[PDB]
Design an enzyme around this catalytic site. Structure first.
Site, PDB file in Angstrom:
ATOM      1  N   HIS A 197       0.811  -1.249   0.000  1.00 31.01           N
ATOM      2  CA  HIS A 197       0.000   0.000   0.000  1.00 31.01           C
ATOM      3  C   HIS A 197       0.830   1.279   0.000  1.00 31.01           C
ATOM      4  O   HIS A 197       0.253   2.325  -0.289  1.00 31.01           O
ATOM      5  CB  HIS A 197      -1.078   0.037   1.084  1.00 31.01           C
ATOM      6  CG  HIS A 197      -0.710   0.335   2.482  1.00 31.01           C
ATOM      7  ND1 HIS A 197      -0.415  -0.611   3.454  1.00 31.01           N
ATOM      8  CD2 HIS A 197      -0.821   1.556   3.116  1.00 31.01           C
ATOM      9  CE1 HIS A 197      -0.219  -0.024   4.627  1.00 31.01           C
ATOM     10  NE2 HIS A 197      -0.544   1.268   4.438  1.00 31.01           N
ATOM     11  N   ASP A 228       0.114  -7.617   1.790  1.00 28.77           N
ATOM     12  CA  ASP A 228       0.527  -6.205   1.842  1.00 28.77           C
ATOM     13  C   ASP A 228       2.047  -6.185   2.111  1.00 28.77           C
ATOM     14  O   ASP A 228       2.558  -5.839   3.208  1.00 28.77           O
ATOM     15  CB  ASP A 228      -0.230  -5.348   2.827  1.00 28.77           C
ATOM     16  CG  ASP A 228       0.005  -3.855   2.709  1.00 28.77           C
ATOM     17  OD1 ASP A 228       0.416  -3.321   1.674  1.00 28.77           O
ATOM     18  OD2 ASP A 228      -0.224  -3.172   3.744  1.00 28.77           O
ATOM     19  N   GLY A 246       1.357   6.938   8.757  1.00 24.65           N
ATOM     20  CA  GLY A 246       2.765   7.420   8.589  1.00 24.65           C
ATOM     21  C   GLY A 246       3.783   6.287   8.832  1.00 24.65           C
ATOM     22  O   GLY A 246       4.991   6.487   8.572  1.00 24.65           O
ATOM     23  N   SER A 282       3.098   3.103   8.274  1.00 27.24           N
ATOM     24  CA  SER A 282       2.967   1.974   7.336  1.00 27.24           C
ATOM     25  C   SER A 282       4.324   1.617   6.662  1.00 27.24           C
ATOM     26  O   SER A 282       4.952   2.554   6.194  1.00 27.24           O
ATOM     27  CB  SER A 282       1.979   2.336   6.234  1.00 27.24           C
ATOM     28  OG  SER A 282       0.688   2.230   6.861  1.00 27.24           O
ATOM     29  N   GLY A 283       4.445   0.354   6.338  1.00 27.62           N
ATOM     30  CA  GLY A 283       5.620  -0.141   5.667  1.00 27.62           C
ATOM     31  C   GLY A 283       6.742  -0.437   6.671  1.00 27.62           C
ATOM     32  O   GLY A 283       7.556  -1.332   6.285  1.00 27.62           O
TER      33      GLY A 283
END
Ligand SMILES: N=C(N)N1CCC[C@H](C[C@@H](C=O)NC(=O)CN2CCC[C@H](NS(=O)(=O)Cc3ccccc3)C2=O)C1
Ligand SMILES: [Ca+2]
Length: 223
Positions: free
Chosen positions: A40, A84, A175, A177-178
């Site tokens: 994402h 994801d 913020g 994410s990942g």
């Protein structure tokens, strides 16, 4: 990160910042040329920032490297956020030192109850929005699959786990994410999704990296 503390400069040497003129996601360095992140976070124009503490000030120790390519998992589903995960190849190999180091891939999945370190530069508010300059850290256990499913019935696949606190107050947020979830020195999770930030009985959801180790290895070998 909501409810966490300041990590301390360069104490999470595998943390990356994805930048497009502002910080939009995190990611983890797994070797000198590859970062893991979430599907994402996928966009064009990504500059990988390594060795960052304060993302607003050049302090020393940063390496700014263009992504050469981004590989979203072919089975990623943007409705469900199943698969994801994304790999990003650096235009050139980072310089690995004490400040900038790669995190190992697990060889087996973590159990419920394992304590992990999550980190990012995402919103520090449960309500409202307050972004930090410096990296924040959070200690959070992996919940049981039963608890995870009773929190998000019909939404949890076998490639996701829940981590955090049912009591609300501590979580990853916009913020983040990942970014990494590291448990005993391996990367077990990727920040993925949830429901608001640090809401009671709505723990964060993470990509279950142990399910992707072969895919990662296979894809890196061929690229
Ligand atoms: N862990 C919790 N609570 N999170 C919830 C707040 C967004 C956080 C990270 C963030 C990207 O940086 N992930 C999401 O935006 C992935 N995603 C997109 C769709 C909506 C979904 N829920 S909502 O934003 O909270 C969601 O979590 C994840
Ligand atoms: Ca900086």
């Amino acid at each position: 990160i909501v409810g966490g503390y300041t990590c301390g400069a360069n104490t999470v040497p595998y943390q990356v910042s994805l930048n497009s003129g502002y910080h939009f996601c995190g990611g983890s360095l797994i070797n000198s040329q590859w970062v893991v992140s979430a599907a994402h976070c996928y966009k064009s124009g990504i500059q990988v920032r390594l060795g960052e503490d304060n993302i607003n000030v050049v302090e020393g120790n940063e390496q700014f490297i263009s992504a050469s390519k981004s590989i979203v998992h072919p089975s990623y589903n943007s409705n469900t956020l199943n698969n994801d995960i994304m790999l990003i190849k650096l235009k050139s190999a980072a310089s690995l030192n004490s400040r900038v180091a790669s995190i190992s891939l697990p060889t087996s999945c973590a159990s419920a109850g394992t304590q992990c370190l999550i980190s990012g530069w995402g919103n520090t508010k449960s309500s409202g929005t307050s972004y930090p300059d410096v990296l924040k850290c959070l200690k959070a256990p992996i919940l049981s699959d039963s608890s995870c499913k009773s929190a998000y019935p019909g939404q949890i696949t076998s490639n996701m786990f829940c981590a955090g606190y049912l009591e609300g107050g501590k979580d990853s947020c916009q913020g983040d994410s990942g970014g990494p979830v590291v448990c005993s020195g391996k990367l077990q999770g990727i920040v993925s999704w949830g429901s608001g930030c640090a809401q009671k009985n709505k723990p964060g959801v993470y990509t279950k990296v142990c399910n992707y180790v072969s895919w990662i290895k296979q894809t890196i070998a061929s690229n």
